[PDB]
């Protein structure tokens, strides 16, 4: 019983390193994506300075 | 909500630099035009001095 119960807690609490590592990378990528696009946007207002006489 | 709200406040309170910069130019052009006409007008009465005085 101890074995099957230990097995059960694992299927509920234990982390699937494979799936989690995949997510950790996925998040890091989307983070880099946001960082770059944010920098692209932070420079957008500069456009005014140009059309500004 | 905050975003859409900031977006809305912009569509009403912020300045569309493009349109405004165009307007400032037109205003300046009209001003330089008016000044030119005005100077020609300031000398209009001089015509009398041609007919003696």
Swiss-Prot record, chains A, B:
Subcellular location: Secreted; Bacterial flagellum
Superkingdom of origin organism: Bacteria
Additional remarks: V.cholerae is able to differentially regulate the flagellins within the flagellum maybe to produce flagella which are particularly suited for motility within a given environment.
Subunit composition and interactions: Heteromer of multiple flagellin subunits including FlaA, FlaB, FlaC, FlaD and FlaE.
Function (record text): Flagellin is the subunit protein which polymerizes to form the filaments of bacterial flagella. FlaD is not essential for flagellar synthesis and motility.
Family from the record: Belongs to the bacterial flagellin family.
Protein name: Flagellin D
Lineage of producing organism: Bacteria, Pseudomonadati, Pseudomonadota, Gammaproteobacteria, Vibrionales
First-to-last residue of the parent protein present: 325 to 377 of 377
